[PDB]
DNA sequence: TATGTACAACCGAACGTTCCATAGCTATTATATACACAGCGTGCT
């Protein structure tokens, strides 16, 4: 994106990611990294080390921290100190986290600068306009009996597994497909995502995929 | 505090056979000459 929108020369550009970890050697240029390879205190790689020497030698600028709603979690904030830069921008679409630590970017990266409405962008054309849906798929007989007596944690697999939801999955999906649609279909549980994509005949993305 | 999830690190060529072109040898006739050799025929024993 940055090459792409700006005259930004490929030279100058370094991606200090577990792939490739070179650093430009030019007077001025960008690294763009991630949290996990910048915010490691214990145990850091030969070729690792170098690197983040690099970073913390020299006086950025600037620093760009997307999705800060992270930045304040207990070990990631160790960046915005380490790193040294006179200038500090936070780029999020949501600004919220369940424990109260979000009120910490003040004193991290500064206040809160400009705010954009989210119905505004989409009847301008600048987003796309959504019909959010919330299927009642009611649990079959046969699966909810169980739910009554198991623990909390195993409750969690019985309900996401009921075969209406299957049902109503594979229904949405090739209705959408016919329509010519580009279907997303999310699940933090993996087992279930590797059961759906196994039974449906679809790629699937999750933690342990090499990049 | 515990459990999920995520992330980072440790195959050639020699020889043989046939085909043009030029020049030279072979055979025949006559004659004188004379030598050596290979025959045939007649008398002797």
């Known amino acids: 994106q940055f090459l792409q929108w700006c005259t930004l020369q490929p030279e100058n550009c370094a991606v200090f990611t577990s792939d490739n970890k070179e650093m430009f050697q030019t007077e001025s240029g960008l690294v763009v990294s991630t949290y996990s390879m910048v915010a490691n205190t214990r145990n850091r790689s030969h070729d690792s080390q170098k690197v983040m020497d690099f970073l913390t030698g020299r006086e950025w600028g600037f620093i760009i921290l997307d999705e800060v709603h992270v930045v304040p979690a207990a070990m990631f904030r160790r960046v915005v100190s380490t790193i040294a830069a006179h200038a500090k921008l936070g780029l999020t679409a949501t600004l919220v986290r369940e ?68 049902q109503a999955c ?23 995502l590797q059961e759906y994509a196994l039974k449906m005949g679809k790629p699937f993305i999750y933690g342990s995929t090499p990049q």
Request: net charge negative; proline share 3%.
């Open 99 to 166: 424990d109260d630590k979000i009120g910490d970017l003040n004193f991290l990266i500064g206040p809160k600068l400009y705010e954009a409405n989210w119905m505004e962008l989409s009847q301008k054309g600048h987003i796309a306009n959504v019909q959010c849906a919330e299927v009642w798929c009611p649990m079959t007989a046969e699966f909810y009996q169980e739910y009554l007596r198991e623990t909390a944690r195993k409750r969690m697999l019985l309900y996401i597994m009921n075969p209406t939801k299957f």
């Open 170 to 192: 594979q229904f949405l999906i090739q209705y959408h497909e016919r329509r010519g649609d580009k279907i997303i279909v999310f699940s933090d549980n993996v087992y279930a």
